[PDB]
């Protein structure tokens with residue numbers, strides 16, 4: 164049964180025994196399956212991999228508008244991955260997601276995920292609609308479901324202070340874990356993302372944050388979270404591989 | 419026999435078949451023996467480790483003021499490690515070195531290393547004195563010996579523009595490979611060193627550069643050279659094995 168804890172002083176969130184914000188960064192893998200058959204096979208393949216959090220990319224699921232189908236898929240994943248936190252993420256079309264839902268539908272989808280008791284966390288996008296996000300965060304918390312809030316820029320890297328402000332806004336909206344991913348156009352852009360990470364974590368955060376500079380040029384941002392302050396990083400099962408990611412994180416954690 | 423190449427197209431220096439500035443950053447390990455028996459035992463212990471350049475920290479050598487002893491030790495190392503470039507480095511007292519030498523002794527020590535034919539590269543400190551550096555750079559080049567020019571700040575990180583200007587000065591003085599190492603006092607300081615690395619690489623470098631932010635906090639500067647533009651990194655036998663592991667992953 165879902166249960167999470169969080170410490171503002173330690174800047175941690177504990178979900179299904181995993182302490183996000185302590186020790187080495189956590190590895191998140193994303194499950195993408197079009198049908199229930201695909202979701203089940205992918206979860207089995209993922210069971211063989213060394214990761215910490217399973218993200219289900221619901222926007223890749225064809226039957227997302229059928230509540231019963233979404234519940235069936237979530238249950239199938241939970242049966243295979245019984246001891247790792249499950250993050251429910253519908254990436255909206257606006258945010259690069261594979262299909263479109265209206266705001267109301269997206270909110271209802273996330274509320275249904277909270278109600279199911281099958282997921283430990285939900286992802287809500289920063290620019291969804293502040294009033295609905297606040298209401299949904301409250302609903303999630305009332306049911307012991309934690310909230311990751313996300314923002315993506317697939318084309319550029321905003322100024323450091325703008326990245327910081329977005330992470331602060333996510334905190335303000337009640338996110339348990341603010342998350343941002345930006346695309347570098349130059350090497351300096353990767354450093355901008357790391358600078359924002361350090362400034363946020365040292366000055367404003369009272370919880371864990373997740374940050375990433377995308378593309379091969381920004382890979383170092385997926386590896387250096389322990390020193391700069393990103394609490395988790397994404398790896399690929401089938402990007403940097405989960406095995407290589409753990410190898411490097413382990414090296415950097417050694418005292 | 420000593421010979422090196424260098425190109426301003428891909429910004430490389432090739433020494434004993436090793437192309438510095440191409441692909442993944444190169445790993446340098448340092449020999450710090452006090453006596454010839456320590457130097458030989460260390461070189462033998464390092465022979466099978468996976469690194470690219472052997473640095474001899476001559477300031478740790480007790481008989482550094484005995485010319486014959488230095489030449490004997492260089493020969494002993496060369497005999498054991500035959501397939502890797504040998505970098506002769508006397509770290510001066512001002513730069514944190516273990517012993518003190520007059521400017522005159524320091525320059526003569528480096529000239530003697532060049533003349534021996536036993537070393538592929540020498541390290542010269544940026545603030546040794548311009549006339550002395552230029553003459554020694556010229557002397558090394560006359561004998562097919564490459565020059566790494568170095569600068570260290572063991573207590574703080576200068577501003578990015580200051581770091582860039584020092585690297586640029588090393589290029590102007592004729593360094594084949596400018597090298598700088600600074601100490602972070604904050605995490606932002608680590609990023610300042612990386613920023614200087616990127617700016618130097620895009621604005622002024624026409625050769626490989628080596629940069630580092632010291633301490634556990636600055637470890638990412640030892641790992642991320644391929645993307646940010648540092649051509650080499652030091653490890654010890656973070657370990658050399660772990661360093662190669664990470665560099666290989668980042669090269670993929």
Ligand SMILES: [Cl-]
Pocket residue numbers: 258288289290291313314315
């Ligand atoms: Cl958003």
